[PDB]
Design a protein around this nucleic acid. Structure first.
Ligand SMILES: Nc1nc2c(ncn2[C@@H]2O[C@H](COP(=O)(O)OP(=O)(O)O)[C@@H](O)[C@H]2O)c(=O)[nH]1
Ligand SMILES: Nc1nc2c(ncn2[C@@H]2O[C@H](COP(=O)(O)OP(=O)(O)O)[C@@H](O)[C@H]2O)c(=O)[nH]1
Ligand SMILES: [Mg+2]
Ligand SMILES: [Mg+2]
Lengths: 171, 171
DNA sequence: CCTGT
DNA sequence: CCTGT
């Protein structure tokens, strides 16, 4: 098994390319209200979970919900790519505002895997350049995560490692 | 700063080249009796902390002491290079035997810094090739530490980061 | 997907 | 320093 220890007061930030399996992973390990998805927020504001033109509004809503949850001391999982430092920054800041611990969970899978999964999706597929870009951004992000303020940094390096994950929620 | 959370019952495994500052770090952050040094154990068995021919006996003694401490539920820090997977393996197994949390603290410093510190030591020095090899081994070790069984993996990427470290021991 | 060409 | 092959 791959045991990932997290405090009750965690902001768990999933970091991974489109096609890396973030949403599937979130559903497997967490209750629906614990997971706040950027795509779901695109849906909330626009009726379209895949409308990229409303990204600004979607993240405003996501950050607002994250703020309310952490204020109430509720463990929260951010299901978005989080592969740009500028995306992670407000999440860290909000977590610190409410004395919650940022946790990074990185889907460090080969680009080929994500591309194959994307090609086999029966839902929204992205163009190949999106996944190539996201993967490069994810890999460039790994080294600096602790310094950004992530108190726990967990890297998953293969589908086997992802599958072996067990979260251990320390009370 | 750079806060590193560790549970009260931890086996903290320092990972770094000779000259990376492991022993200094251990002295700053932990009780003298919490730190078990491989060089000290070379001294215990042979009178000579620098005698590499008694390495087998020294690590036998170190492992024995670690086992006794974890049996008694006492936090323990291994002050050795730990840059070889074969060195880390038996430590992970002892922690497992006694349900102790293994923690990795990596001194990911440039070889140049370790070489300079080594050159300026007054007590004991190693050959330059040793530090070149230790640094290569340290670097190759980073990716697989979580998979080896280290439940928390902390990488320190500069002297500035090492200096900023504060441990948070959680009851 | 925090928004090609 | 878990001993350069
Ligand atoms: N084989 C395999 N496929 C997966 C896994 N996780 C997700 N998928 C598939 O990959 C596609 C995208 O998964 P999703 O969770 O939406 O990834 P996301 O784009 O990062 O949110 C879907 O068709 C999933 O069924 C996995 O662990 N193994
Ligand atoms: N400038 C500076 N020198 C250090 C630091 N830590 C250790 N040193 C020096 O580097 C040399 C080796 O340090 P030591 O703790 O013995 O490292 P070790 O060989 O990895 O156990 C000693 O002479 C130390 O005084 C540090 O944080 N800053
Ligand atoms: Mg998704
Ligand atoms: Mg030392």
């Amino acid at each position: 098994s791959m045991k990932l220890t997290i405090p009750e007061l965690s902001l768990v930030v999933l970091i991974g390319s489109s096609g890396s399996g973030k949403s599937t992973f979130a559903k497997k390990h967490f209750k629906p209200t614990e997971v706040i998805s950027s795509n779901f927020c695109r849906g909330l504001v626009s009726d379209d979970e895949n409308d990229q033109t409303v990204t600004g509004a979607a993240f405003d809503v996501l950050h607002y919900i994250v703020s309310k949850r952490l204020q109430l001391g509720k463990l929260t999982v951010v299901d978005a790519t989080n592969v740009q430092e500028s995306a992670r920054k407000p999440l860290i800041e909000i977590a610190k505002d409410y004395h919650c611990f940022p946790v990074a969970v990185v889907f460090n899978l080969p680009e080929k895997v994500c591309q194959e999964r994307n090609k086999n999706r029966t839902d929204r597929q992205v163009e190949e350049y999106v996944i190539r870009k996201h993967t490069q951004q994810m890999k460039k992000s790994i080294k600096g995560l602790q310094r950004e303020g992530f108190r726990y940094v967990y890297i998953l390096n293969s589908p086997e490692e992802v599958e072996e994950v067990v979260f251990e929620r320390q009370p």
